[PDB]
Amino acid sequence: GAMELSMQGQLKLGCIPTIAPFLLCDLVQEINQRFPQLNLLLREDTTTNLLTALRHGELDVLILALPVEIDGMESRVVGQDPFKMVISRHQAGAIKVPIKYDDLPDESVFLLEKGHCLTEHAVSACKLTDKEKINPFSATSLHTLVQMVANGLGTTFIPQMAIDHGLLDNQNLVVIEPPGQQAYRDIGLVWRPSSSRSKTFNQLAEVVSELL
Amino acid sequence: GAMELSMQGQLKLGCIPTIAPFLLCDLVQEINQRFPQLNLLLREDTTTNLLTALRHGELDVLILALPVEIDGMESRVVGQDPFKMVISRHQAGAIKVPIKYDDLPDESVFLLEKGHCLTEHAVSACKLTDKEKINPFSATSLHTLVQMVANGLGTTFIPQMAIDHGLLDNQNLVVIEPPGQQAYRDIGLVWRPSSSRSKTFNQLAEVVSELL
Ligand SMILES: [Cl-]
Ligand SMILES: [Cl-]
């Protein structure tokens, strides 16, 4: 017979569509080795929906792009994710580098629908002020946004973690620096102040910071 | 001065999240060369939302997994996308091959939320009849579903086109054949019967069939 006897057990973690496919792959491989009793149940959803789920106790912690509205929550910024622009190789001649937005055709910049925080972060961080350059057809996923660029329709802003995880592979794209010397987004963890699991969240924050 | 003068112009194409990241990359590279004046505006959304958009004339054509409810629309099946199961390498010993669902632990099969047609297609095609094997926490994207499997939490069904496009890269997974000799989903194009662009859609259908 036998005698019966913080990074242990189950965690429900939410993450946005422009981070989850990329960073969470690395996070899972790291915690598999370093914290092998931690089981991560994962939710992918856009920022507003994740915040509601967090406030309602349906998720324990979020990995978000910041800043976004997170009134009343605890957060910790864990790193920075640079922005690049991308263009198809077959349109790369028709656009000169360094990029000056004023020299692009009108309606040449494709962006995600506004429910995705990537658009607000990229437009402000990369200083796109001329709305006439934005194409009126809004993209609805990062993959189909890139595919439209790969089809030659224009340009867009892409996070570095997507490039590092192969999003552009076999799509014959060229990666360009955007305007601005603050062309990145912050990445952070967000949780409830009343949570008893702060020690767990801060250990996870350290792991995530090492992946950025 | 100068004199002024079917696969030409703009097409709005909708596609589901478990196809769009994979097949559309190939489709864009093929049409870039074969039909260079065809501009593809892309929408990614789940099946029900795409059907509404198609019926309302907000999209021209869909690439769907079939069968799903498409009353009143024209469709054409263009190929078959096999299913596989996946498990983490570190749990691969604890699950014997060939897979018999009855020998899996209860709650070991993770599935997408029901708004994603992958779950109905995979469960019927791969003959999962024992609901006790399904984990009650539903996944909300194909990427985070795979990441939970990579974390060792269980197993799931994945479409072959995702495997062929590198979804499992660097996640230390093992690919297994599911039960059944009809373990695949049909892929098809769907459009309005009153459309005047049938010649365009049938040419696109031929291109897509060559990618499967
Ligand atoms: Cl978002
Ligand atoms: Cl769907």
Domains of chain B: 1-81+187-212 (3.40.190.10), 82-186 (no CATH)
DSSP state of A120: H
- B143 and A24: CB-CB below 8 Å? yes
What is the Cα–Cα distance from B15 to B29, expressed in whole angstroms? 17
Strand bridging mode A156-159 / B9-15: unpaired
DSSP state of A177: P
For B39, the enclosing helix (H) or strand (E) is: strand B38-44
Q: Residue A93: CB partners within 8 Å, gap ≥ 6?
A: none
Calculate Rg over the CA atoms of chain B: 19
CB pairs under 8 A between A and B: 109
Cα–Cα distances (Å) from A206 to A9, B50, B77, B148, in that order, read 18, 40, 49, 21
Cβ atoms A178, A154 nearer than 8 A: no
Which value in Å is the resolution of this experimental model? Answer: 1.5
- B152 and A31: CB-CB below 8 Å? no
Biggest distance spanned by C-alpha atoms of chain A = 78
Cα–Cα distances (Å) from A130 to A109, A124, A202, in that order, read 10, 11, 40
Report the candidate in A180, A175, A178 with the shortest Cα–Cα distance to residue A86: A175
Q: Residue A1: CB partners within 8 Å, gap ≥ 6?
A: none
Strand partners, B167: none
Of A88, A140, A150, the CB nearest to B45: A140
What is the Cα–Cα distance from B156 to B112, expressed in whole angstroms? 9
What is the Cα–Cα distance from A6 to A166, expressed in whole angstroms? 34
**Sign of torsion over alpha carbons B190, B194, B195, B199:** positive
Cβ atoms B152, B91 nearer than 8 A: yes
Residues of B in contact with A152 (CB under 8 A): 32, 39
Give the A-side interface with B, CB within 8 Å: 12, 15, 17, 20-21, 24-25, 28-29, 31-32, 39-45, 88, 90, 137, 139-141, 143-144, 147-148, 150-153, 166, 169-172
DSSP-derived secondary structure for B5-27: ----EEEEEEE-TTTHHHHHHHH
What is the Cα–Cα distance from B177 to B157, expressed in whole angstroms? 10
Q: Per this entry, what is the length of chain A? A: 212
Residues of B in contact with A147 (CB under 8 A): 20, 24-25, 28, 40, 42
As a dihedral over the C-alpha atoms of residue B62, residue B63, residue B68, residue B72, rounded to 10 degrees, the angle is: 30
Q: Residue A158: CB partners within 8 Å, gap ≥ 6?
A: A83, A84, A85, A86, A142, A146, A167, A168, A175
List gaps in chain A by the residue before each (C–N > 2.5 Å): 5
Of A20, A28, A140, the CB nearest to B151: A28
